[PDB]
């Protein structure tokens, strides 16, 4: 007897300042009888290309969770990162060794998180062999190097600083430089980020992130 959208109300989602494009669309929710409680905890996943306006990030997605509401504006915070399935299926190819590492670490903000990084072996410029398999010693060494690097950047930074590092892909270049002597590699990427635990909420630390 009631069309539900007569009672719905629209809200505009705003992204953190760390991303270029704050406008990330809008959502809807039932009008308060409150709308805030249903709104809070809502998670939206969006490609980095839209937020940065560059097609160089076509294969990466960011999950942002709603943490505050003010006057129809939903102030969100970084919640996770992932790759698109097509890109991962593209990288994973025959005749090469896959080296994947994961590390659990807490930022300077007590944000406990888990970083998954992936890399693959590549053949040299003059290489003639079909395959570029790496001996298990080299794989273990590279995995250790990646783990140390990721722990170092995460521990000595805040979550906002961590995202600021994630966007330009500096960590991937650092891994490439560190692992250059061990074995040649390609497609070095921070495959995924999970946010396991959260500290006590601080609306000031969110407003500062949103300006």
């Amino acid at each position: 007897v009631v069309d539900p959208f007569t009672r719905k109300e629209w809200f505009d989602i705003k992204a953190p300042s760390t991303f270029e494009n704050r406008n990330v669309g809008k959502t809807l929710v039932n009008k308060s009888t409150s709308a805030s409680d249903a709104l809070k905890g809502r998670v939206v996943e969006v490609c980095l290309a839209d937020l940065q306006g560059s097609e160089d990030h076509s294969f990466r997605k960011i999950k942002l969770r709603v943490d505050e509401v003010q006057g129809k504006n939903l102030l969100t915070n970084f919640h996770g990162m992932d790759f698109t399935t097509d890109k991962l299926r593209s990288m994973v190819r025959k005749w090469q060794t896959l080296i994947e590492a994961n590390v659990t670490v807490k930022t300077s903000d007590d944000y406990v998180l888990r970083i998954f990084a992936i890399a693959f072996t590549r053949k040299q410029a003059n290489q003639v062999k079909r395959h570029s398999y790496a001996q298990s010693s080299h794989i273990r060494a590279i995995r250790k190097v990646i783990s140390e690097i990721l722990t170092k950047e995460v521990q000595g930074s805040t979550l906002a600083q961590l995202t600021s590092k994630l966007i330009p892909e500096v960590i991937n270049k650092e891994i490439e430089n560190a692992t250059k002597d061990i074995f040649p590699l390609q497609n070095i990427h921070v495959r995924k980020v999970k946010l396991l635990k959260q500290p006590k909420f601080d609306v000031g630390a969110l407003m500062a992130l949103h300006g």
Partner: peptide, 17 residues
């Protein structure tokens, strides 16, 4: 020279074959 690159490719095809 870049002709060396041509040599590697020709070998690569022969190996793949």
């Amino acid at each position: 020279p870049e002709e060396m690159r041509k040599r590697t490719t020709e070998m690569r095809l022969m190996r793949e074959l």
